[PDB]
Design a protein around this ligand. Structure first.
Ligand SMILES: [Mn+2]
Ligand SMILES: [Mn+2]
Ligand SMILES: [Mn+2]
Ligand SMILES: [Mn+2]
Lengths: 455, 455, 164
């Protein structure tokens, strides 16, 4: 039995006397190992819960639990997708089992000083291939987020995107120094100025021969806070503030494999936010690409300032025309207080786009909830000096940040904003298919959203 | 012209040369006073904004601005509801103008050491009467919330409800001492024990001859925090922690005027949360009316503990049977971080009830957003000692508190939870129809919700 | 011997885990009395006026703020076969008193009687082992609570030896 075989069991399914004696009750993610019938290999009995309540997430989580229980085995065959009786069709089971296996195997050992084959048993080969690709993209995002900021600097991150673009056949332009200055991304330049690592701006285009979607990803490779320095003695995953950029890049790398008939452009501002003799100051004013002005009332609300000019560039009327814009950003720390650590916030004025993103997230097994663009919170954007502030010092910053970003989206362009600060990094232990640390959150939601949009 | 007449003006409507010279541009809530044509009285020109974008809230706010600009006049006639051209029908205009006038006139002068008539001009007399009644109920809630806690103690609040019930014809039972102990409301008793003011429990029933709806209102008349004492030097409106109870009581007082064909029971636990030699302790366990247990990990999360047993009582299978339960509570301080100071949180697993409450709030002009009952946040209810904790000390307490309350709602009973901590008290200056301090938030949403449910 | 040592440890675990509202100083004194009776240990519980006579003014002053009055318990293992004294701190709930522990910091305030728990449990194991030595347990039990009548910063306690 190829070293280890993992069998999915719904509640009520038969297992041997040994599994029963060990307490196997088919609880989701429960794994009991036993010798195979011939005594030459290992069987894992893996719980899928009641058949009537099982979802694709159940299969995804059960696959992750299987690969975690593999021990020193060289080969693992997952039969989980062959369990029927639930409402989850075979193709969705196969896709989810494939995702969960890759996501569950993920390790980040690059900075530390025998499993050779995972096989998914199913006729749904296409679904398996899609699952593997989606999960591999997620793991790419995980690597990028986990990467120490001293390795993944803005220049190094730009180089990495260039290499990934080259592999995938994606068109890539990297802007730096004077070339960057010409673009008028004054938020990026101002925020990035304090650091010894100069900022970068990268555009990625997936453009198959077969609507144009713009993806904007916040790539603050290290967020210290700037002069409004993050308190020492509080823990912050400061290197993880490029999770939005990671999600966008990774999603873009998966599109050529899927062959989606839609044009997608990625827009990635990359910078460090550092305290320094030449750092952006509280009370300074940024004049943005659209001529409007932002007073910097708190240097740690840097992401919205960096994204502003990119949203103008991405959405402005011009050559070939981006029909809709989605931004992804580890933007706000206020959200998590209400929503908790595992749910992202979705903002959009477009109800059908909201539905498209939420349904995409459900298929992907990623938790989002929509928050309203409350008109009465615009009063908290007011500045005594400029057109707006980047920080009100009042409650409601998650909503205020969304309204701030909305100011820079050209009139009539459908737009959605994904604030993923909390779910982008897991500071608790591993659970299900999610490791400690960088999660790659939103990659799969984005892929699913782009699929629906292409249909 | 009866001292003062207020005329509604949409953008583009004609005003005299004087109003133009003063800068009147029909901006919503803008008021420019001028002599009447005959020179004997005062005309207020009041902005209603563009006709195409005006809503009922525009009329409500314009009416509030009118009554604020009345000066020393003895009589005020509002003609605002006679302005047509907008999408707001005459009856809705009249209702809103009536509400706004009363809400805008509200003052709380009881503890400080000429306007004799406001008239709303319209044929829609019924709509005016409904608006006045809804606004008067709101103002009752405002008074209750503004009341110093040393005056509105739990015993005094129970007496006040008894008096209000008697006026309205509502059946009222007040429980205290041993009689209270018999009900098994052990959360209420435990939380209330530290104070010198003993707790109370009050049930109110509107039962016209013409479904049974249960309303549960958190009535913590003073929330100091208990032994987990609220930090001195932070400002908290500790007397306002009975805003939920206020909203429920006030809504119940309005029902006999409206003559709604539905039975509605109010359930009001009333207590002070005080530090004391005999106060509830961190690590103590409450055994609730359903036999389940709650570990007190933070004494300042007292409201959910108080509400728990009342929700069991309100929803248990028994005589005549409460078909649905809505609780209203100034429950959580985490919500406001995400949602801001003017929006309540709505929780329910029932999508149609969610729609009913949200649409009711829209008609009432009160801001709510629905938050999800996230299954993955139940893990944060776990206790090493009891069935659950009242505080996880983690992010997501607004959602966790809702899930906590959900545990006590009997199976199959539709339920909604309204968390209104922030919008129940305005700690900024007055705006539109909203004063500084107690707002009476949720009263009108509740009335509108009960109307829809009765239809 | 292993089972007995571990069972004593588990008794201490129960006492520490017990919610302070159940394991009050009076209730803890009752529990020790019951455990002493089982084991054959001599037990004296002091309370109210009887407690006042002993001159344990630290205990009385610290315990005064709480609605749960303090207790003092002596336990003696005295087999027929040196005299060792064991003194165990039994603050059944430590809120901090008027110097109130900051809310928003986590403290296992009910666990402040762990010393008393360890001493009581150790004493319960001695009759099983049959050790040839006399051992007395001395257990002051109180809550430290904020209150209108709680011990104040700047107050002076005059102790049983006359020092302050
Ligand atoms: Mn920041
Ligand atoms: Mn940032
Ligand atoms: Mn509280
Ligand atoms: Mn409270």
């Amino acid at each position: 039995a190829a070293d280890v075989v993992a069998c999915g069991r719904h509640t009520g399914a038969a297992v041997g006397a040994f599994s029963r004696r060990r307490g196997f009750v088919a609880r989701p993610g429960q794994v009991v190992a036993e010798p195979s019938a011939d005594g030459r290999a290992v069987v894992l009995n893996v719980g899928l819960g009641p058949a009537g309540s099982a979802t694709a997430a159940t299969f995804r989580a059960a696959a992750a639990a299987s690969v975690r229980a593999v021990g020193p085995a060289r080969t693992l065959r997952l039969d989980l997708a062959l369990a029927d009786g639930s409402g989850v069709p075979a193709a969705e089971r196969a896709r989810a089992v494939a995702e969960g296996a890759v996501l569950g195997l993920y390790r980040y050992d690059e900075y530390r000083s025998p499993l050779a084959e995972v096989i998914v048993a199913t006729p749904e080969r296409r679904a398996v291939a899609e699952g593997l690709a989606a999960a591999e993209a997620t793991c790419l995002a995980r690597d990028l987020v986990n990467c120490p900021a001293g390795t993944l600097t803005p220049p190094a991150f730009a180089d990495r995107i260039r290499e990934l673009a080259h592999t995938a056949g994606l068109d890539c332009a990297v802007y730096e120094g004077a070339g960057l200055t010409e673009l008028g991304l004054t938020g990026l330049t101002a925020v990035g100025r304090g650091s010894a690592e100069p900022p970068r701006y990268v555009e990625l285009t997936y453009d198959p021969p077969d609507l144009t979607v713009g993806l904007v990803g916040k790539g603050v490779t290290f967020d210290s806070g700037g002069l409004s320095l993050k308190p020492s003695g509080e823990r912050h995953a400061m290197k993880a503030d490029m999770g939005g950029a990671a999600a966008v890049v990774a999603a873009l790398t998966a599109l050529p494999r899927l062959g989606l008939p839609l044009r997608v452009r990625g827009h990635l501002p990359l910078a460090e936010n550092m305290p320094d003799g030449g750092a952006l100051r509280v009370g300074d004013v940024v004049r943005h690409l659209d001529g409007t002005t932002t007073e910097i009332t708190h240097t740690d609300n840097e992401g919205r300032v960096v994204l502003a000019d990119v949203l103008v560039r991405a959405s402005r009327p011009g050559p070939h025309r981006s029909d809709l814009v989605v931004d992804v950003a580890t933007l706000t720390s206020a959200a998590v207080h209400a929503l908790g650590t595992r749910t992202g916030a979705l903002f959009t004025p477009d109800d059908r786009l909201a539905q498209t993103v939420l349904a995409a997230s459900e298929r992907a097994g990623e938790s989002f909830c929509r928050l309203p663009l409350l008109a009465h919170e615009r009063r908290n954007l007011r500045s005594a000096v400029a057109d707006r502030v980047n920080c009100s010092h009042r409650h409601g910053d998650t909503i205020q940040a969304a309204l701030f970003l909305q100011d820079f989206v050209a009139a009539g362009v459908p737009w959605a904003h994904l604030d993923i600060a909390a779910p982008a990094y897991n500071d608790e232990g591993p659970y299900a298919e999610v490791p400690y640390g960088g999660t790659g959150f939103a990659v799969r939601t984005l892929i699913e959203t782009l699929r629906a949009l292409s249909e």
